[PDB]
Curated annotation (Swiss-Prot), chain A:
Biological classification of the source: Eukaryota, Metazoa, Chordata, Craniata, Vertebrata
Subunit note: G proteins are composed of 3 units, alpha, beta and gamma. The heterodimer formed by GNB1 and GNG2 interacts with ARHGEF5. The heterodimer formed by GNB1 and GNG2 interacts with GRK2. Forms a complex with GNAO1 and GNG3. Interacts with ARHGEF18 and RASD2. Forms complexes with TAS2R14 and G-proteins; these complexes play a role in the perception of bitterness. Component of the TAS2R14-GNAI1 complex, consisting of TAS2R14, GNAI1, GNB1 and GNG2. Component of the TAS2R14-GNAT3 complex, consisting of TAS2R14, GNAT3, GNB1 and GNG2.
Task of the protein: Guanine nucleotide-binding proteins (G proteins) are involved as a modulator or transducer in various transmembrane signaling systems. The beta and gamma chains are required for the GTPase activity, for replacement of GDP by GTP, and for G protein-effector interaction.
Species: Bos taurus
Name of the featured protein: Guanine nucleotide-binding protein G(I)/G(S)/G(T) subunit beta-1
Positions annotated as WD repeat: 1-42
Transmembrane segments: none
Source domain of life: Eukaryota
Family, per entry: Belongs to the WD repeat G protein beta family.
Length: 48, 114, 55, 495
């Protein structure tokens, strides 16, 4: 249930979120070059 | 009509109590067999029967009879009339493969000390 | 071998007793006609009319 | 009069009850005659063995012996009744378990007359003592748009506070004293003298009367208990016997347009100011108002796991299929119905895509997939404003069970958009909308198979949305395995 996304100005990070009430940040330039989840910014009490 | 299966169950168990609950029994398939009190070991292709015996808040025991003198025989000790005695003895004289008709049963039961 | 070493109608009838101290019922106090409930039959394998007949 | 009673009795054991309980109340003398007749019919059953006609008699006795204005000392009706119902201990459960609890009530009524009606009234009013304090509250959860205006009227009437603690204490004292001293007391003089007395002294008098009644009921011997109670009441202190009916209990009527039982905790705030105990929730019910059982679901587990209402009260829910006759019949049912009917709740073992596990319960149904997703968007609102079904690949093993213990297994791998489970030990009618051909339209093959137990395994890359009991607001996706098998606040039925 993704509702939003946001390319970082640097181009290294991308963010997304939705009804999960979490802003999942992903790193495109990963140590191993994979699409790895950098962070789960949780704390919001409603859909992102 | 052709009989296909059968099963038997004791209604009083081995410790003087009546049967209560749900019982599922396996079926022997068709003597001293038809008087069998065991369940079929073949639990894979055997006809099964499920029955219910109503529960009871307390055990349904069955007491032991107590021995009491029976004057019906003690003081009944004078020789019976020769005709009735003749009938009794003539009845007793047949082979054990002679089926006792109801009449004979009643006669013998009344004369249960001759 | 080591398998260790493994009443009367008056005591087993409700009548003459207070319901508080009832623990068993003699079989001879129950005048209800015997009753049994059948549920069904089940054969896993198919070999018409059928009918149980208890006796 | 006797033949009228016999006709009514034979026509109520076929609004035929209310008429019995309204013809006897006229004359203090009609309560013994009816009881005698009941015993005769009861004895016939005891002689015969007709299993199906005992519980209505066992409820009519309890109901009349508790409204009987007074039992003459000469009449030995209670002893004959106890001898008649003592011989049911040999009957199958539950008859012996209704008779044991009737015999206890007949000992409470043999030792302390009127105790079983003073307990009820005390409780229902909320006018208990500081030794044995209790309370009962009735909440009329009714939907204004569904209930009829006749029922709305009856509800309004019932809610109106009729009695006061003063009047309630006067009625309780009058009936406790009358039950014991029959006609030999002056109920007009006693009422006139009690009217001028103050509320506090009335409360003290009732507390002593209730303690004396309880202690007399506690005495082993019946014969001396009555004399001791009579002497105690004389120390505390021919006419015509008077029928004292049951005072209306406390009731509250709240407008329930919702389906969840959250309303109740909001009520509990004014309970902080309005105070084990018990709460009589009288749910008024329609066909779809299915969802009431779904709300029951929460209030069952939710509370069992987060006790909030149960902290003080024992809840009891009453289903109405939807003073005047409806008021009387309602109160009588709620008062004398005391045997619940628990409905089956299916159990589900869920393994999530993460790997966590927690057993759950679906009372009504279990939907999955396109149905689950559709309900997910129905519960979105602004989401559904800003927001075909690609099939979900599930390997499903369903087992058909039996009392014999021989489970017949079968299995299949499928690629179906949705799968809903629906109710017929029980049977679970199941639907499987297969995607015979994926595309914005997927071929739909509704498959109705009769499964009781099911085992669903979905690919970890194919999370499947799951709805339990049609609860559109809490669908569960991200599950990878689901194992389903057929597993205080009771609902209640009169029989």
């Amino acid at each position: 249930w993704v509702m939003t996304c946001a390319y970082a100005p640097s181009g290294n990070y991308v963010a997304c979120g939705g009804l999960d009430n979490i802003c999942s940040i992903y790193n495109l330039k990963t140590r191993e070059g994979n699409v790895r989840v950098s962070r789960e910014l949780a704390g919001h009490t409603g859909y992102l | 009509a052709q009989l296909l299966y059968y099963v038997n169950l004791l209604l009083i168990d081995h410790r003087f109590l009546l049967r209560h609950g749900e019982y599922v029994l396996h079926m022997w398939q068709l003597n001293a067999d038809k008087l069998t009190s065991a369940t079929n070991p073949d639990k894979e292709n055997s006809m099964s029967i499920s029955i219910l015996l109503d529960n009871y808040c307390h055990p349904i025991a069955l007491p032991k009879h107590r021995p009491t003198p029976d004057p019906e025989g003690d003081r009944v000790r004078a020789e019976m009339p020769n005709q009735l005695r003749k009938q009794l003895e003539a009845i007793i004289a047949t082979d054990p493969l002679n089926p006792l008709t109801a009449e004979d049963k009643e006669l013998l039961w009344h004369f249960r000390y001759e | 071998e080591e398998w260790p070493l493994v009443g009367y109608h008056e005591q087993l009838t409700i009548h003459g007793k207070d319901h508080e101290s009832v623990f068993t019922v003699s079989l001879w106090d129950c005048d209800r006609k015997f009753r049994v409930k059948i549920r069904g039959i089940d054969i896993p394998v198919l070999p018409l009319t059928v009918f149980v007949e208890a006796n | 009069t006797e033949d009228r009673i016999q006709h009514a009795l034979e026509r109520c054991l076929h609004l035929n009850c209310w008429s019995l309980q309204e013809l006897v109340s006229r004359d203090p003398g009609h309560f013994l005659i009816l009881l005698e007749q009941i015993l005769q019919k009861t004895r016939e059953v005891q002689e015969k063995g007709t299993y199906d006609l005992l519980a209505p008699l066992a409820l009519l006795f309890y109901s009349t012996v508790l409204c009987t204005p007074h039992f003459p000392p000469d009449s030995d009706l209670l002893l004959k009744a106890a001898r008649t119902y003592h011989r049911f201990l040999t009957w199958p459960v539950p008859y012996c378990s209704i008779c044991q609890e009737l015999l206890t009530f007949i000992d409470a009524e043999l030792k302390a007359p009127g105790i079983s009606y003073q307990r009820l009234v005390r409780a229902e009013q909320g006018l208990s003592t500081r030794s044995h304090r209790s309370s009962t509250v009735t909440v009329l959860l009714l939907n204004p748009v569904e209930v009829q205006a006749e029922f709305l009227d009856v509800a309004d009437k019932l809610s109106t506070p009729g009695p006061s603690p003063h009047s309630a204490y006067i009625t309780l004292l009058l009936h406790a004293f009358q039950a014991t001293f029959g006609a030999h007391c002056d109920l007009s003089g006693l009422h006139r003298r009690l009217q001028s007395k103050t509320l506090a002294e009335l409360e003290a008098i009732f507390t002593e009367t209730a303690e004396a009644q309880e202690l007399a009921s506690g005495i082993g011997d019946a014969a001396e208990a009555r004399q001791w109670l009579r002497t105690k009441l004389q120390a505390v202190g021919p006419g015509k016997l008077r029928t004292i009916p049951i005072p209306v209990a406390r009731c509250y009527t709240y407008s329930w347009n919702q389906d969840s039982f959250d309303i109740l905790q909001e009520i509990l705030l004014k309970e902080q100011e309005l105070l084990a105990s018990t709460l009589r929730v009288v749910v008024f019910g329609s066909d779809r108002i299915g969802k009431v059982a779904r709300a029951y679901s929460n209030l069952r587990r939710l509370e069992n796991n987060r006790p909030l209402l149960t902290r003080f009260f024992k809840l009891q829910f009453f289903y109405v299929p939807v003073l005047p006759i409806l008021a009387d019949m309602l109160l009588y049912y709620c008062r004398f119905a005391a045997r619940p009917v628990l409905l089956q709740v299916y159990q589900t073992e869920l393994t999530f895509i993460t790997g966590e596990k927690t057993t759950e319960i679906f009372i009504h149904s279990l939907e999955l997939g396109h149905s689950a997703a559709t309900r997910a968007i129905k519960a979105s609102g602004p989401g559904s404003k800003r927001l075909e079904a690609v099939p979900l690949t599930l390997q499903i093993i369903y087992s058909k069970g039996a009392i014999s213990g021989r489970s017949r297994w079968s299995n299949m791998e499928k690629l179906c958009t949705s799968v809903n489970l629906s109710k017929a030990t029980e049977a679970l009618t199941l639907n499987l909308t297969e995607v015979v051909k994926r595309q914005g339209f997927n071929q739909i093959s509704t498959s109705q198979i009769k499964v009781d137990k099911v085992q669903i395994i979905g690919s970890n890359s194919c999370p499947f949305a799951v709805c339990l009991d049609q609860d559109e607001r809490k669908i569960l996706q991200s599950v990878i395995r689901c194992e389903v098998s057929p597993c205080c606040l009771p609902i209640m039925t009169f029989s």
